[PDB]
Subunit: 188 residues, 3 copies
């Protein structure tokens, strides 16, 4: 059992695995590492096709919402593909889908279902396009909720990533973000 | 039951004093990862001049002080009732007698060396989780980013929120969650 | 011993080269949390053109390089004497022979892909812990954001501090503490 039940990830070098505008138009690298009562996370994203590859016209943001059921399992019609979202085995994922990941879900006491507009449910910081300090992008992570254009979409748990560069002209650049570290309180 | 997390609980009642007793809810979670502590912090004001922000208020400050065993001092500006080791989403019932493993390391962050760069963690957080409303957070370990706090303590953690130059009048003072780490005493 | 933390010690003597040998004190602590390393970094210059900042100086750079076993190369710009696994507030005296579990993952951060966004962590730190004195810190894993470091290594970690546009002349170069994490090789 080369398994590691304390890390849930996309793999460190994913194939296209998520939908920012269309199916598999980006590679999300997301690693969740369980440190008891807190999850330690790293996230980065790279667009591979469409209006973010390269950034065209008037687009100044990108959004991904990941939704899980009561067992911490991705919902049907997930915008993150489930095939390579699993517990760690070396640099790969287990092949058999997990049945329970509640230990990696954002705590519902800390981050209640209807509370996405609450300050505590948001982690907000700058990341940098192409790892370039002169090209800031704001990242807003929302736990068990959304601040955007209205979400009472059923899920038990959720994690929302919103990248925004209002005011910046990044036309003809590929949308790709520096790696960002964060933590949140675990459900169990 | 979990002796590797010391917290306020994830959903505290008013539990700290920014300008008067119990005028805010501090959510502070400390998770021991051996030689480093992994921490998350958020604050929400519930009454007074921060709820909502009034007049000329452009900052808020909290100092938490501990004794040599890592126990909150008397006259604490963080209420000790629900500051304890984790049990579910609650605290253990019996007050802890030792948390030295969660205290900021005195070799790394010496007592009253708060003006030293290394004893400070400084970053932007965001009012109401709103990217257009930045607030600077300065965290100081075993000191204050200022001349002497003269109340003795073995260890301390100081939080200073500042929004000089911004007009947030009539907004409730509430901060996005912020992750940091620091070197543990043992 | 504590084989889950690799560090400079929490209060190092001068131990790294920004512009000359031992012209700075780097505090760097790496704590293994399975698949991720939790890190804290701070730097303090002690002599030369950064102590205090003089003339035209608006940046500082350090590259740390390791072999296939995770051991510092010869001609290291971080001194190997006090870079080791934790023993109290000190280091083990006998040099480590393997630290591959602390190295940046090659699948995530491929060798010489320093211009790739994912291999960079970028944020503001603050001179003297002062919120009015920002400094950008760019961390690069297994590469350098300034291209083509030509010195071969199995693994590397690059730190670039930049304050273009700011006049910090006559200040000592000293940074607030900064937390980050990265995917571990094993
Ligand atoms: Mg910033």
């Amino acid at each position: 059992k080369n398994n590691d039940k304390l890390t849930l990830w996309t793999t460190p070098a994913p194939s296209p695995n998520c939908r920012l505008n269309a199916e598999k138009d980006a590679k999300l690298t997301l690693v969740l590492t369980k440190c008891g009562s807190q999850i330690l996370a790293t996230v980065s994203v790279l667009a591979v096709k469409g209006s973010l590859a390269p950034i065209s016209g008037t687009v100044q943001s990108a959004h991904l919402i990941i939704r899980f059921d009561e067992n911490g399992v991705l919902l049907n019609n997930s915008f993150l593909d489930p095939e390579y979202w699993n517990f760690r085995n070396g640099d790969l994922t287990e092949g058999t889908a997990y049945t329970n990941a509640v230990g990696f879900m954002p705590n519902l006491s800390a981050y209640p279902k209807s509370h996405g507009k609450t300050a505590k449910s948001n982690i907000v910081s700058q990341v940098y396009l192409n790892g370039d300090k002169t090209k800031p992008v704001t990242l807003t992570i929302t736990l068990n909720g959304t601040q955007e254009t209205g979400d009472t979409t059923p899920s038990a748990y959720s994690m929302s990533f919103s990248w925004d560069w209002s005011g910046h002209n990044y036309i003809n650049e590929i949308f790709a973000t520096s790696s960002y570290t964060f933590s949140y309180i675990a459900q169990e």
